[PDB]
Structures are given as C-alpha cells and as structure tokens.
Amino acid sequence: QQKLTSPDNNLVMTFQVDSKGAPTYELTYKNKVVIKPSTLGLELKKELDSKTNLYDGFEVKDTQTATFDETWQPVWGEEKEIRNHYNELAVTLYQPMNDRSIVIRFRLFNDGLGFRYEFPQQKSLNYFVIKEEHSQFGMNGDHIAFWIPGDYDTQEYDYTISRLSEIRGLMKEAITPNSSQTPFSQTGVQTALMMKTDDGLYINLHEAALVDYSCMHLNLDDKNMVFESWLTPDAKGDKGYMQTPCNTPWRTIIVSDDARNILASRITLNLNEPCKIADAASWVKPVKYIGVWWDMITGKGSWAYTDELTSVKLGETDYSKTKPNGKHSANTANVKRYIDFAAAHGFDAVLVEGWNEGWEDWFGNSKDYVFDFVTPYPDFDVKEIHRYAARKGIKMMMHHETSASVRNYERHMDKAYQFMADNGYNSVKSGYVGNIIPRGEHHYGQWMNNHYLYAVKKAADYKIMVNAHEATRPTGICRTYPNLIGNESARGTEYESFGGNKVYHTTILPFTRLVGGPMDYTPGIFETHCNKMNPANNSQVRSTIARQLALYVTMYSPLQMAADIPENYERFMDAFQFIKDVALDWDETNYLEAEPGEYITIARKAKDTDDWYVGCTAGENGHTSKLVFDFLTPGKQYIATVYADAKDADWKENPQAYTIKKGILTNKSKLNLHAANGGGYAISIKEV
Amino acid sequence: QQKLTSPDNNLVMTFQVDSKGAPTYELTYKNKVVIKPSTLGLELKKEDSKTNLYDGFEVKDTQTATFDETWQPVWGEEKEIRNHYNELAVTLYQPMNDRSIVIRFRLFNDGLGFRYEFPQQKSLNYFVIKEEHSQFGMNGDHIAFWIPGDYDTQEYDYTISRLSEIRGLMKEAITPNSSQTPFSQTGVQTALMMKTDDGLYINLHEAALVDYSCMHLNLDDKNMVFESWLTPDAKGDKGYMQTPCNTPWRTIIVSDDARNILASRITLNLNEPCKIADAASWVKPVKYIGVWWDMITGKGSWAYTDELTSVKLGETDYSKTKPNGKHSANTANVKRYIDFAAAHGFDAVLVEGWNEGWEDWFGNSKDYVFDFVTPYPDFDVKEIHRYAARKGIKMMMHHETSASVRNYERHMDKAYQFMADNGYNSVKSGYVGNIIPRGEHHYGQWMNNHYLYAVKKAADYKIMVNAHEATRPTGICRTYPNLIGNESARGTEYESFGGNKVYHTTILPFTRLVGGPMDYTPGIFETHCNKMNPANNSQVRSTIARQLALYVTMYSPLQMAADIPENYERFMDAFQFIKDVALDWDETNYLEAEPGEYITIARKAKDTDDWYVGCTAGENGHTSKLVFDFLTPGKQYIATVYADAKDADWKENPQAYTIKKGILTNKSKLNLHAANGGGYAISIKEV
Ligand SMILES: [Ca+2]
Ligand SMILES: [Ca+2]
C-alpha cells in the first residue's frame, strides 16, 4: 500500500497491488470517498496467451515521489498565468510471467488527480496492440450526471441530466439522428463527464493529452456504479497500435465541494507538454469574426453554386457553363458587404463557406474527391476579396469542410495551406461532416486523432491557426500547439437552427466540453426565429438576446463569432455594442456563480487593461444574482453598461425583450439582477 | 438476338437478354464454343429493387462501329500495334428502377473485351457495388495454369491442373506469405490461362483497372463457370461509383495457336492512349544491377545496426549506434557496384537499405516506418550521386513503404523532390506487409487509387516507377508509360526463399505479363544460395543458359542483372549476353510456345538490324529446330549461341553451358536442346 496526498492535504490517493497482482487506486476528498477501490490495466491483442495480460500479475519493483510547483503563461487563456502544483507518485510494476514492466504515474493536485500508464522500451515490450484499456472509476453513489451518449463519431447531442441508474432508460431518447454516429453501449457516455453527488461534491471525469492514442469514452456498469475506460476501435475492432517507449493519455478526476472550482481547475492544461511553437506569441492571435454562414445553416442560402446538376466531378464539371441557383451566398458582392460591416464594427475576420467548387455534392455521398480546397466558384473572386479585405484591415478566415474525406484532404493539404498563404488567409475552419473515408474508421479513433494533430502541426509550419469542427473533443493539446484556437466537437449554435438546443445547454458546456479547450460555439443570434431567414424553417433559438451577449463571457474562447446576419444586428445595434466591446483574451477570471444545468456567472479582466466583462447564463427557471463588485480595484471608478433581460423577457415567448443601463460602479457596488428563463445578462465595466 | 463478328469472321459473339431480362452472351471461335451462354450484371449495396443491376433489362438501343488504327508504344515488343475491332454497344433499360446501363463489346481476331458503362442520369448517380457477376462459362474441364485467388499477394507458384482439380489442390497451393487473404477454395487470380481438349488456348483477364476494385475469378466447379469476384474494402463493399463511370474491360483472348496468346495486344488496345505528352523525351528503358541479392539471400542486411529493439525516426540517433558489419548499402560498396555497372554498359544501380528505418521494416504494422529522404550514416547521398553521374550511371531510388500507405502519401512530394534534387529519375517502390490503413487489402479500389496516384504524381516529376506488391498490371502503361514495371507475381527473389517451380518462366508470359512487364530480376549465375549465406540452402531452379534466355522470354523495358558482380566475374563469357541484349524492340517473333513447357522468342532490337533469341523450358527440357528465315535476305550475321552443355541440369549441373560463335543468314537452321529447367540465348548481330 502506497499513499499520496495533495499539497493542501485535502485529497488522498491510495495505491496498492492486490493478491492477484492487479493495481488498484482509490481517492478521498476532505475525508469523503470520491473514487472507490478501482483497478488499472490493459488487455493486449493476441499476436502466447499470457502476453495479452497487462492488467494483473504485477509486483511493485520501485517507487519514486516528487513535487512540482511552477507557473507558466499560455499564449491565450482565461488568465495570464497558470500554476502547475502537484505531488507525484510513480510506481514501477513488474510482471514476472512476461518479464516486462510498466509505470503508473499519479499527479495529485489540490483540485484532483491525474494518472497515466508508461511503457518503457525494453527487451519484451516493443510493438503491441491494445485490445481494451481497463481503467476504472468506481463511484460512491448513484450521482446526478450531465452526459451525452458515448459515440465514436459525433458529440453533437443535447445533454441529459439524470441519475446514473437512469442513464440506461434514457439512452434511446438521448440518441438523436446525426449524419455520422456510432453509439457503443446503452450505458456508454462521453468525457468530460460532469457529476454532482448527494454529499455535496462535484466530480469531473476526463482525459488529457490525447496524442498517438485512441479517444476514451466511459462505459457505466450501472449495477455497481463503476465507469470504465472504453476506447474507440479502428476498422478491425482494435484500440491502438503502440510502440515503446510510449505513454497513454492522462486520465483525470477533478473534484471540489464548490462547483466554481471545477471551472477554475487547470489540471487538463497542466498535464499537457509545454508549448512546442517557439514563436507562437508573434503570430497566434485571438479572432472575433462574422461570417457568410447562417444563410446556409438556416436554409436561406446555399453553399452550392448551382442546382442544375445531379452530381459534379472536379476537373470535369465546368461551372462557368452552369446556371447560378440564385441562392449562393458566397458571391463577391455579398462577401464585400460582410467585410464592410466587419470593418465598421471592429471585427478581425470574415468567414465564408461555399466559396469553392464541390458543394453540390458535400453531404452524405461518401465522396472521395469531394473538394480540392483551392478552386473558387465563378462568382467568388479570391484576389479581389483579398484586396478589399486587406484595405479594410480585415482577414478572411478560410473554410476547409472535408465532408469527412480524409485521404483527400491530406493529399491536398500542402497545396491548400500554400493557397492560404498566397492569398492572405491565416486561419481556417475545417470540418469533417459525414462518415470517415477511409471507410471503416471512426472520427475519434487513433487513426483520425493522428490526422487532426497532423493538420495542426503542419498548419503551425505555415503560421496558420486551426479551428476544427467534428474533430475529437479537446484535451489540452492547445498548450502544446497554441495554434489550435478552436474546435466545435459538441453541439453548437447551428443546432438552434436544426430544432434547437436545450435551454440549459450553455450552463453545462463549460463544465464538460470546455474542459480541455475552447469551443467555436458561434453565439450572437439576435433574431431567434429562424423562420425569418427561411420560412420553411420553424426552429427557434432557445435563448433571449441578453443571454446571447452573456455567452461572449460564459463560453470562453479566443475565437468568437457573432453569428447572425448584419441586417439583424442593425435592428438591435444598442445591444450589439456589447459584442463589439467584449474582449477575447483575459488576465484574470473570477467564477462568481456556478451550478451545472442551472446557472453560470463569470467576470473576466481583459488582458492588458483594467476593464472587466461579466456574463450570466441561466437555465429553464432563470436565476437571481446578487452581484458584489469587490473584484474591482479600490479607489477606481468604472463606467458600467448592463445589458439585461426585461422583466417580462422569456426565451420562448419574449426573447428580444432587453434593457440597457449605463452607470458608475466601484468595488463597493452591488447589483441585483434576474436572468429570465433561458435568459442571462452581460456587463461591460470600463475603468474611467 | 444481337450478333457481332471478328474482322476475319473467325469469332462470333451473340448477345440477348433471357426471359427475366438478364444480359447473356456467348462466344465461338472457328465454330467451337469458347464461352457458353453466360450472364452479365451487378448487385448493388442496399441504401430492395435498386440492389438489382443484373436482370429486368430490355434492349433499348444498339450501336455498331469498326475501328482500325495503328499506334506506337513508347517501349514494347514491337514498334507498332494495330487496334482493329468490330464493336457492339447495347443500351439496356431496367423499367423497374427507371435506369439504363450500356454494355460495350469489342471483338478482335484474337478475342473479346466487354465492359459495363453507367451513364449519368436521374436515377443512377452514387452507388456502391456489392458484387460484380460477370460470368465466363467454360465448355469443358480444361487444363488451367493458376495461382490462388487472393486480395493481398500474387507471389505464389503456379499449379497446372484440370478445373475440377482446383478445389482439391487449393490448400497446398496457398503457401505462407506476410500478407495474404485467400477467398475461396475455387478462387483463382487473373490473368488465367487455359488449354482445352479440343485444341484451343483461352486467357481470361481484365484491362484498364482504374477507379475500381481488382477482379479475381471464382470457379463454380459443378458447371465450370468462372465468375468475377472483386476485392472487398475494409467494410466488405466492392467499389464506390459515381456516374458517368465504367467498369474495367473483361477480356477473353483465344486462339488455336498458343503463340497467338503471347502476340495479342488486346489488353493494351483497350487502355486509353498515352496521357504523358512528352513521354518519349524522358521515359527510357533501364538495364540495371543492384545492392539487393546480398539482403535477399541473408548475406547482408538492410538495417544499419542490430543493437536496437526498435527505432523511432527523428528520435533514434544512428550516428550513435554500432554498425552491424553487414549493411551492404554503404558508400564504398555502392561505388564498386557503380564501377561494374559503368564498365559493362549498364544504365543504373539500385540500392536498398540506404535510408533510416530498416531495423523495423518487416511485419510490425508500423505507421511511421520510413521518411524516404534521410540516409543512414554510411550512405553518402551526394557523393554517390556525383560519382555515378561522372561514370554515366543513374542511381535507382528505392521506396519500400512496408505497406504503410498513408505514411508514404504524406512523404511523397518530399520523396519525389528529394529524388529530383539528388539525380534519381526512377524508383522501385514496395508494399510488403498488411496494408495500413488497416482493414484494406492490396488490390481493393482504395489501394488501386493509391498506386495510380503514385504513378501520376511521379509523371509530373518526370519519374519512372516500378512498383512491387502493387495490383498486377492491366495495360495502364499505355496511358502512363512511366509505369515501367511491377513485380506483382512470384519473382527471382523467391528462388532464395526455397525456389520457384522449374516451369515458372514458361507460364508467366501467358499470365502475369498480359497487361504489362515484370521486374523479374533474372541473371543468377551462382544458383546455390548457400554460397552467399551458409544458412540459406535455397537453390535457383535454373541453368545459367536459361537465366540468359530470360532477357528475351521475360519481356520488360526494365531488366536487372541480379547476381553480385563477383559472381558475374567468374563467368564473364556467359555475362556477355547480358551486356549485349537490348531492352526495347521493333519486332517480336514468337517461335515456339506451350504454356508450362517451353517458350522461344526472337526479337529485333529497336533501330537496329540485330536480333536476340531466348528459349526457356520446363521440367522435361525442350528440343528446338530453329529456322532463321526471319533474318534479312542477302545479309550476314554474327551469331553467338549460349546453350546448355550436354547433361546440364537445373538441379545437378546448373553451371554447365557452351558458347559457339559463327555466321547465320536467313537460310540457316539450328538444332538446340534446352535441359531440364534449361534454355539457351542467341545474339545475332548484322555484320
Ligand atoms: Ca457541425
Ligand atoms: Ca516482393
């Protein structure tokens, strides 16, 4: 038996090898059980039977302990500086029957535990294939969980809030239709998984540094309340090709008696390798943008240039011989009106989708040669858009939807990134909509994880920033490659056009999806009835206008869209001011209020300023805030503008009802505010 | 009932739909049935009635044409090829699915090709093939020359048996390989060669295997019907299609004379004309030697060091490892090969083992296995370049991928630029091991796309490609003549792995060579492998004279002299034939041919009045009465005859040969005997 304690002494992890030589761990917090005794280990694919066993028959050959305490600065983040402070136990475990050794490394922080497996180079462990990882997390009770279905292919599901014992009965309805989805179990859920216990704890289960390895989901044993690592299989059912020396990703248990401290934890980032982009600070930069986007997402407009053809063949179809469909939003004149608005209002960039040949066939065809990423449609003048944008101090953000055709994207990748450089594009939104090609792979297997990271490492060579939709959900790698400024990789604002997101969605994402990296959520919908874009579309955004403003503060990202069309912003320009003002990068963050599923309220100090921005987002019952502004600087005065729900505001019946109040605040000020149902508020607080 | 006839009237193809609308064809030759009534169609993957693309058809329209044009390959067995056929195109409408296909038939004096065409139309755009059902009904229990149907290797010895005997011989026919997936107890590969009891020779194959999965044949041995059996992808599906598109052609080449099978150019004729406009300025035949046989026999290693349990590229520091003392691809050794190549008029030298990574090359399913650009510490890329260039020798690049295909694609532009920067203009690639991405097979639609992509990209860099382990050829060299070889069959390397059957080279030209040349790597003079490495007791099943013969009887613009220089130096008199023999031809005359038994071929060297002759023979040897009436009237020629000595024998007496020099004219006749596993070679040079 071996004990490890957090620096503050509040957490204790006990490790032991049992009688069958299986490694076991457990974890307590303030003397409460968080993880019950839980085994660790892996089973390997057969090439001898005993070699398949990397889960028991071990003995402790060595232990080492260490303490780390160093502060580092992210290129962009929720605060200027992050402290990485932990006590470590490393245990060398030897398996006589196989004459081989592994190491399990534990790092225990004041806010939780990380563990991983290490496989040293040695005579009898070199090349191996993982059949299953058997990392357990035994729960001490039938907790409340906030979860989406375990799935190898999508995370674009609404959350469910339920007991662990209720997950099974709810899985069928929780799995809604998607273009690519492979659920794996009636009790399978994804990470990060957020839980609230009856004895007042908050527990988050996740992984960190998902590199050269398959994505971990969790399979719940709902009779014993034990979660277990369930990795994503390849086209043959295997779960990772390994070569020593190599490590698994970290597995993390983040725990506190204060839900706010889950949001504050930096465990995920802390467990990633330090920045490998030496010049990152010189070129990696936050981006606020608008886009030719919502037209197509609502169905008002098309990505396609033409409706005349039953299919297209790149290099054969002559688009100049085709009839424009009259709906193609990515045309030069329209694009320039977006640049105009962007530049009028202080935005950095304009995204355009549907600019390149191919879009007629983008959806659900399993098409290999679906795009070339370089050839514009006849009505999109690349160089003139570039000149016009540059004139206005605006950057165009590139769009590389791959339609999940991965070999095809790789073959064009250097040409595509060269085209970006040649044409003044320095960020790209990529996409992987559809089932993966090569066919047989899943979006989150080891094979695709390699692709996503290859795309980002190659981008870094071109000084290009990457925002990858449909990719594996983040696990802190942005620390290592700060040019990964976004993913979607969860259910975003676009689904508010596809029937809606749950009213409580944005009170969950920061506790789950956001752990490991920002999301390109694309907030800022002011006209929430999609039927005003497209009369055939009766979807309604589940939000008030004020809650949309809040999201620029409650959905942290160095990449922030204002997603509505300019004409809609023009109708509510007074509210639009908050989107214009809000910063993208922060020196400090204060988590003021937080309860998963119910409300989140955050105040952040804009980097290199003494201005603060506050947002509150609420669920189905609203939320009353008693805000206390003692985080402001003593003796200073600030001009505060409060953008709040009207008293009769409601996400469904009255979403555009907002108030704007401008006044002075100091560190002695207090405000009482009420977020409507599916409502919220935003405050800018600028030092006089 | 539609009827199509060959230009010379000897072949007749009849077509009709049966009473359930199934497309049905049959083929006769000189009034003998070659193909019994046989059906054509496909079954499609379900997105019920739409899965049927095999019956319910009605003939909507027919069109006929005749084509007769001559064209010139960049390299080949003759200067000019005549493309002469009658064509029938049948539009088939399927009312139940409101869609049409076209089946196009081309009928030559030596056989039939057909393909399916899928026009763009409202009700047929994207579709996935579940199975293709092209039938070839045989008229008897023919003798066949076959290798096991397999998605992953063709490196098998041939078996000669009745169709009815295939099932019982399959188990023994499937020998161990590092990547192999047999599919049927009666599954064989193409090109399949057959000899009938009523005196015909029949070859079943495909042409222009592009954007489609490789076709094998599955024998129904009750009815004697072969049927197309495509190669599945990782999910079991057999081709992603998008209209307008076509299947490759399916070919039945038939004659009452076996020599006419070798003479046929149906396969090339059904491929699209050359797409490399400047091919003739840069695509050139290559005679080569190489640092190669050392490693194949186990005398030397590809690896630089033995002291590591595995390597990681960009982490492993080879300059800090101990050389194993056996790494043949070192500068000094390479320069000696270059010396011998230049001395003897060779074009190039291959070197394998030159690049980081070889320690882990075999069977690890390793992704990042090679980078194709970083030399080991004892291989000085620049020094070897400048030396070879000064000696008038080109280095041939080696890209073994170890079947890690995404890894190769990621490195490919860089690898090709490295070649261009370092004076390499030809590359031998390899795909040894199971394919990565894992789940795909070597011959599926996915990989066929890969091999051709590597070729088309190479052509943009003016690079010639010789791809081992790739899908066996189907005449695409006509379209991209920088594809100057494949192995894609069992080559000489396996003579080091236990031996090839004595009759192997009397079968390949009837099977593997139909569709394109083979990098067979002939020319082993020291046929006992234990002289290279004492632990290898493999013996090449050949005489020295038969090895010489292979420079004529195994056609290829790419020809290796595969033995080590010191072995050639022991037999420099026999070596002279290898030095003299040409690589490219204005004419070819097939003098004698019987599959499994003997092949004798005379060819006229391009732009000369010189001829070269080879005979290769099986287990029983062969006696030729050669008649030289193909030489020019009134001319005199210096002939050098390299023949098996009396009582030469592949097994007991392989190195016994004679050399006789004399004058020949078109009135000359010679009687020659090829030993068991023997043969002979003749150079015939105009005075
Ligand atoms: Ca999406
Ligand atoms: Ca081979």
Residue numbers in the entry:
A (entry chain A): 22 to 68, 86 to 726
B (entry chain B): 22 to 68, 87 to 726
List sentences quoted exactly from the publication behind this structure.
Here we describe the three-dimensional structure and mechanistic characterization of the enzyme encoded by susB, a GH97 α-glucosidase from B. thetaiotaomicron (BtGH97a). BtGH97a was shown to hydrolyze a range of substrate sizes from maltose to maltoheptaose, and both α-1,4 and α-1,6 linkages. The tertiary structure of BtGH97a reveals three domains; an N-terminal β-super-sandwich domain (residues 1–317), followed by a canonical (β/α)8 barrel (residues 318–636) and a C-terminal β sheet domain (residues 637–738). The three-dimensional structure and kinetic analyses of BtGH97a reveal an unusual calcium ion-dependent catalytic center in which a glutamate residue is poised to activate the nucleophilic water molecule with both general acid and calcium ion assistance to leaving group departure.
The structure of BtGH97a was solved using X-ray crystallography data to 1.90 Å resolution. Phasing was performed using single-wavelength anomalous dispersion data collected at the peak wavelength (0.9795 Å) for selenium, and the majority of the protein was built automatically. A calcium ion is present in the (β/α)8 barrel domain; it is octahedrally coordinated by four glutamate residues (Glu194, Glu508, Glu526, and Glu532) and both oxygen atoms of a molecule of ethylene glycol, which was sequestered from the cryoprotectant. The calcium ions in each molecule of the asymmetric unit in the native structure (and the complexes described below) yield atomic B factors of 14–16 Å2 when refined with unitary occupancy. Superposition with other (β/α)8 barrel GHs (data not shown), as well as the presence of the four glutamates, suggests that the calcium ion is, in fact, bound in the active-site region of the enzyme. The calcium ion displays high apparent affinity and may only partially be removed using EDTA or Chelex. Partial removal of the calcium causes a substantial reduction in activity, but the enzyme maintains a residual activity, confirming high metal ion affinity. The addition of calcium to the EDTA-treated enzyme resulted in restoration of full activity; all further kinetics experiments were thus conducted in the presence of 10 mM CaCl2, at which the enzyme had full activity.
